[PDB]
Amino acid sequence: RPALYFCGSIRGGREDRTLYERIVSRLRRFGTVLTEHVAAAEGDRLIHEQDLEWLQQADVVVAEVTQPSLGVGYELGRAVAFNKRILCLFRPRVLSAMIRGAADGSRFQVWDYEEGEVEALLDRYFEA
Amino acid sequence: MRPALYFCGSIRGGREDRTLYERIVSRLRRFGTVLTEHVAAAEGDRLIHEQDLEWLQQADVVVAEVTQPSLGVGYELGRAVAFNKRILCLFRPQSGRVLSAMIRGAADGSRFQVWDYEEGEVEALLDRYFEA
Numbered sequence: 624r625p626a627l628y629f630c631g632s633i634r635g636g637r638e639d640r641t642l643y644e645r646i647v648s649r650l651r652r653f654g655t656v657l658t659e660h661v662a663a664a665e666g667d668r669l670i671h672e673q674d675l676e677w678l679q680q681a682d683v684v685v686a687e688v689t690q691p692s693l694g695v696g697y698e699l700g701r702a703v704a705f706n707k708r709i710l711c712l713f714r715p716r717v718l719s720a721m722i723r724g725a726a727d728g729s730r731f732q733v734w735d736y737e738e739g740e741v742e743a744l745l746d747r748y749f750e751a
Numbered sequence: 752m753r754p755a756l757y758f759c760g761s762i763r764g765g766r767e768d769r770t771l772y773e774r775i776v777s778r779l780r781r782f783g784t785v786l787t788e789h790v791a792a793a794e795g796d797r798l799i800h801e802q803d804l805e806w807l808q809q810a811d812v813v814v815a816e817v818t819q820p821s822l823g824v825g826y827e828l829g830r831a832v833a834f835n836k837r838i839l840c841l842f843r844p845q846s847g848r849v850l851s852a853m854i855r856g857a858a859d860g861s862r863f864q865v866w867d868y869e870e871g872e873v874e875a876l877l878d879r880y881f882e883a
């Protein structure tokens with residue numbers, strides 16, 4: 624099965640816990656979600672090494688980029704250098720030009736969305 | 752041959768402090784060329800990303816102010832690690848914040864370092880790092 628990596632900001636996880644769970648639940652239909660048991664409220668070297676191992680194992684990286692995060696950005700930077708296929712999900716805040724600009728319409732895509740249509744978008748992405 | 756220094760910080764940290772980022776850049780100029788000294792941060796996006804990536808590849812050292820969360824700063828740090836760059840992260844714990852485990856965990860005490868500091872001592876720390 625394809626290996627899927629999900630990540631999001633700690634702030635996005637706090638205010639929108641259900642949103643991250645909805646994304647992960649939908650991703651499970653298209654493969655194994657390596658980060659599905661991550662409980663964001665979490666020495667640091669062990670976390671970094673496990674994160675890198677999952678990033679290297681992933682076939683697709685799905686990042687929720689609505690809130691600023693050094694961790695999400697760092698994971699995206701490592702993922703680009705690991706030549707991974709990336710999908711960023713943004714809820715229109717101004718998305719960083721480093722993320723919007725990394726998009727190439729194929730291997731790195733950034734999709735603007737409204738909370739309610741996240742399942743439909745994920746279906747479209749993985750049925751293509 | 753002057754060393755090429757790359758500086759980056761969050762847009763929030765640039766707004767809430769302004770003088771802090773300018774103090775850091777001014778001090779870095781003593782030790783080398785600052786590739787990002789003329790960055791406004793009031794910013795098509797692809798051109799910005801490609802210019803950023805060119806500066807990252809040219810750098811000898813990357814200095815990042817990591818006090819406020821930022822997708823851009825994190826992304827630049829991730830690309831910098833993969834480009835095998837020497838990195839120094841500057842974090843202010845007085846802000847009450849806890850630095851991301853992805854950044855604190857990337858530290859190895861040598862090639863990637865994270866230093867906790869108080870606003871007033873930033874010039875002294877930069878002098879120590881660059882061996883003044």
Ligand SMILES: CNc1ccccc1C(=O)N1CCC(Nc2nc(-c3cc4ccc(C#N)cc4[nH]3)nn2CCCCCCCC(=O)O)CC1
Nearest residue numbers: 629630631643644647658659661670673674694695851852
């Ligand atoms: C102030 N910020 C931080 C402070 C402390 C720690 C991290 C951060 C930080 O920068 N973060 C938080 C973590 C986030 N990455 C992330 N978030 C999720 C994630 C959120 C989430 C929510 C719901 C569900 C479901 N169902 C699944 C979820 N999966 N996965 N990943 C990737 C794995 C990395 C973790 C390594 C694990 C090592 C270990 O198991 O010991 C990036 C931003």
Ligand SMILES: CNc1ccccc1C(=O)N1CCC(Nc2nc(-c3cc4ccc(C#N)cc4[nH]3)nn2CCCCCCCC(=O)O)CC1
Nearest residue numbers: 719720759760772773776787788790798799802803823824
């Ligand atoms: C919501 N956030 C964003 C929204 C929109 C755009 C970016 C962000 C974002 O994530 N950012 C902001 C930019 C930041 N990086 C950064 N900040 C500085 C920087 C701040 C600063 C302050 C004072 C002084 C002095 N003296 C010098 C300074 N140099 N350099 N860099 C690296 C160069 C990248 C520029 C590419 C240009 C492309 C082009 O010209 O074609 C990362 C976080």
Ligand SMILES: [Cl-]
Nearest residue numbers: 632633634692
């Ligand atoms: Cl976060």
